[PDB]
Subunit: 132 residues, 4 copies
């Protein structure tokens, strides 16, 4: 609630997030849940109408970032990121769940799951952030 408000503010600061219609669905002790709204510009392969792998990477990076932000009180730079692609993401809205896995004095690690509308896992990933 406090955490949800704080996360929303962070999310709305970024023009890319806004272009993605990104929102906060949940925030608290279990990390963060994000949503984005689908548009035709997201499409990678026109024949399968698949959402671009980089959009999914965005969601992994965002989920981990703002999940760390719940602990720091501010958004954090990404050092590096890994993303696994599991299923093709057909046209529709997406959810990214983000949890902090390690929180040190200067670095944090977060994990993320990206889910489709039926709750199928389409991608997962992890990232290292800088605490500054």
């Amino acid at each position: 609630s406090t955490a949800l408000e704080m996360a929303s503010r962070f999310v709305n600061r970024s023009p890319f997030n806004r272009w993605l219609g990104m929102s906060v669905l949940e925030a608290g002790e279990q990390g963060i849940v994000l949503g984005i709204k689908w548009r035709e510009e997201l499409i990678s392969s026109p024949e399968i109408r698949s959402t671009h792998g980089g959009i999914l990477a965005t969601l992994v990076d965002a989920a981990g970032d703002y999940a760390v932000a719940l602990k720091t009180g501010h958004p954090v730079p990404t050092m590096d990121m890994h993303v696994d692609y599991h299923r093709v993401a057909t046209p529709g809205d997406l959810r990214a769940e983000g949890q902090v896995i390690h929180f040190g004095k200067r670095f944090a690690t977060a994990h993320a799951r990206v889910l489709d509308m039926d709750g199928n896992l389409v991608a997962s990933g992890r990232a290292l952030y800088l605490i500054r």
Copy 2:
């Protein structure tokens, strides 16, 4: 070659996201691929340093490795997984992505990529595994 450059442009322009990125092919040959994209305000992550979103750099790492593999296969290829290192903040400006195939197997390939800004500064690098299929 011009045939390589030809083929790659065609692949690049299939994708609506590529086109929204103003993505173009700068070079294509035995040396791999070089891509460009055109900056726009919607790319911005932190409004105060005007940095290009990390997901955009990842897109570029993914695209460069994809289309570099595609030069060898003749068709675009699905990404299995990807890694990206962020080295410098990318301030507003067009970006270049260089992709090369590192391993070309019978069913998979891995490519490495570098993302450069307008002064040729390295801003990000990465690798990815692709499914031939």
Copy 3:
């Protein structure tokens, strides 16, 4: 969890000379996933200043845990395609534990996650890996 899972994984673990050198064993095996243990030895050391366990050993643990967690589902050990490992804390001299878990299980590929713990239950490393099912 299972005794059949425990017997199966235990057989898989003991097939490897490197696992045996590491004194690797199966602590837990079942539906949730797998837990492995290794026995510390002086040869594992990276830095003699801090007597730290080499990061290559921590990565070996991430790959093993993921492999055997996949293996509980396929019925056989699996080749690794790639892996990522994150290092959080120095693993000082002491036995280590690795928890493995299957994240996605397709007909042809599987992804697993791991956590490497010290004897006090502090997380020293974590990671993920892609495996091929053939």
Copy 4:
């Protein structure tokens, strides 16, 4: 030159009991980066049917190559933040070479890439790693 570099890297390599157990040596060291070798042993084996070298060994090589490529620039070995390794080919029984080189070198962080080769020069694995300049 590539003599002070060799001797410096050699000192770093031999400081580790795990490196010594692996029979690790420095083959090349200079401005372009580092080349390491290890000696094969039966204990290295993963699959006894294939007689494949364990992937943990190949990952140790990615990490070592990168660390010592950075160390040639800092003057000291460096801790690893994280690592990725890609496995391309089975490493059958035999000695292995690892080439390491720095990709980005910053105030506080450095990134390095590695290639693991068999005795015929086939690429067995590759990967990258992030290091902390400090400890």
